[PDB]
């Protein structure tokens, strides 16, 4: 049994099932189609959610290409739109990837 524990928002409960795709199902943790079985989900408002705000979880928003399934992603290289290099402070076509 490979138990994977992670916290996701309550709007993306539908995509966790095998087969579906999206911004979360292909950029961060893609589930193979041949995945036999299901998942376990429950609310965590009383445990993780806080009135003062919780900022302990993150996920990828931009990628050069779709990653290989079940291959861990660790490196957090910055992303750019134009071909001109950007460094120092923000500017034109220079945005924070995450």
């Amino acid at each position: 049994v490979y138990a994977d524990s992670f916290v996701i928002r309550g709007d993306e409960v539908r995509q966790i099932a095998p087969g579906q795709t999206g911004n979360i199902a292909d950029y961060n943790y893609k589930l193979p189609d041949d995945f036999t079985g299901c998942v376990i989900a429950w609310n965590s408002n009383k445990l993780d959610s806080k009135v003062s705000g919780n900022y302990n979880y993150l996920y990828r928003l931009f990628r050069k290409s779709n990653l290989k399934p079940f291959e861990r992603d660790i490196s957090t290289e910055i992303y750019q739109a134009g071909n001109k290099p950007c460094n120092g402070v923000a500017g034109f076509n220079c945005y924070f990837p995450l």
Partner: antibody
Framework: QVQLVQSGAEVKKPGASLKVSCRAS????????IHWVRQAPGQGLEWMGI???????SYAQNFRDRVTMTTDPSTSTVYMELGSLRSEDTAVYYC??????????????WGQGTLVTVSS | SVLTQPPSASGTPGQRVTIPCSGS????????VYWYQQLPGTAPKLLVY???QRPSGVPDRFSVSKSGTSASLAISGLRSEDEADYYC?????????????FGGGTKLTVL
């Protein structure tokens, strides 16, 4: 004495703003959350806003983008500014407090309440 | 106004007074129920919390029970001074917003 003091709403003019100061006495400010309660005449209790003793805040869903509300851990006082007055203001407001852990907590302190009436 | 509360209650003298507080499973079935007694012109006060522990100095003449997704308050030996206001408090999740929505208010009349 352990009491939360808030000034009542006075008469004003269209285009002006109402300032209400809520001050906690008898206990440390950074020990209880600050909560807003509304009660209309012949009606139950409604709640608007939350201000933590030290942290962020939760505004009013209905009264958003036009109510100024913040915190200041210097004089243990908070200030609420109201603009664009309307006849819906006629109620009594409680600047109350709750437990230090929210959710399942005891509402040990209560406020006297401010009577707000707007009419033309 | 999702919650429903009787406008008033009537009954012959010498009969036990039963008040039903019924809602959903999110606020009563899945959450604890708070029982408040509110005096006319006075801020509400918490009297019953958690259905298991009670504050000291409260006589046991009042009784409270929870069945299914509802609760019942039973008072035996009604007196003339029992005319007050009673509030149910629980955590509810609303489409517009989720929070602590209280009741409207119950008024009793004695002839």
């Amino acid at each position: 004495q352990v009491q939360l003091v808030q000034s009542g709403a006075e008469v004003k003019k269209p285009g002006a703003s109402l300032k209400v100061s809520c001050r906690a006495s008898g206990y440390t400010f950074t020990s209880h959350f600050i909560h807003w309660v509304r009660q209309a005449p012949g009606q139950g209790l409604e709640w608007m806003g939350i201000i933590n003793p030290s942290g962020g805040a939760s505004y009013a869903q209905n009264f958003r983008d036009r109510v100024t509300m913040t915190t200041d851990p210097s004089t243990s006082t908070v200030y609420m500014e109201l603009g664009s007055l309307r006849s819906e203001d006629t109620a009594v407001y409680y600047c109350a407090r709750a437990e230090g852990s929210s959710w399942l907590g005891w509402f040990d302190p209560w406020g006297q309440g401010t009577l707000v009436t707007v009419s033309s | 106004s999702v919650l429903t509360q009787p406008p008033s209650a009537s009954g012959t003298p010498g009969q036990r007074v039963t008040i039903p507080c019924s809602g959903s499973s999110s606020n009563i079935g899945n959450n604890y129920v708070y029982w408040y007694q509110q005096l006319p012109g006075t801020a509400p006060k918490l009297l019953v919390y958690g259905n298991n522990q009670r504050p000291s100095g409260v006589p046991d003449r009042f009784s409270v029970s929870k069945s299914g997704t509802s609760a019942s308050l039973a008072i035996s030996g009604l007196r003339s001074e029992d005319e007050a206001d009673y509030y149910c408090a629980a955590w509810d999740d609303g489409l517009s917003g989720s929070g602590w929505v209280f009741g409207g208010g119950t008024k009793l009349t004695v002839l």
